[PDB]
Amino acid sequence: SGMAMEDFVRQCFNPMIVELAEKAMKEYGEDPKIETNKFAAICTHLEVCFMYSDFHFIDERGESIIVEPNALLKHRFEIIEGRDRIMAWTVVNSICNTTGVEKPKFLPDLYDYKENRFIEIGVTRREVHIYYLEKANKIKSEKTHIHIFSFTGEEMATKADYTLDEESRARIKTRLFTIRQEMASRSLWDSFRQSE
Ligand SMILES: [Mg+2]
């Protein structure tokens, strides 16, 4: 049964994440009570996208600052993940009008208004490098920047450009590490790793 992992997921992630995850799975006919490892991989991916975006703003004078919220500040990242297909492409289409950036052929996860590129995010239970290569092959738009995180504290990003400050990236790598430890303590980790 997947009861054990389903309960872990529901206490590990905040309720906004769990709802988004259940919405996405219902939409394409997947049931979180049954595909419990998938349930977890979706929440994790969601939690990473939101963290990546946390605290990053461009201000009135137009430069990217860190804030841990003041009305003339614009969010540094647009978030594309978490939306249904129509809305996602609506946001991407609006973004290509705003900036004039080439429209990508697949939906990526974020848009970065400072570097002016889309970001495809990846979270893997395998090794960071091979995952990166498999993603770069599959996208094959030199357009879209790729940033990969692992549960062992590692990352790999296009051109060795890690986009964010080290402190922000450490915050994400520490979160994934803690999730894996928590899973491993309950002997849920090997099943979640193996299902990838
Ligand atoms: Mg995505």
Ligand SMILES: [Mn+2]
């Ligand atoms: Mn992604």
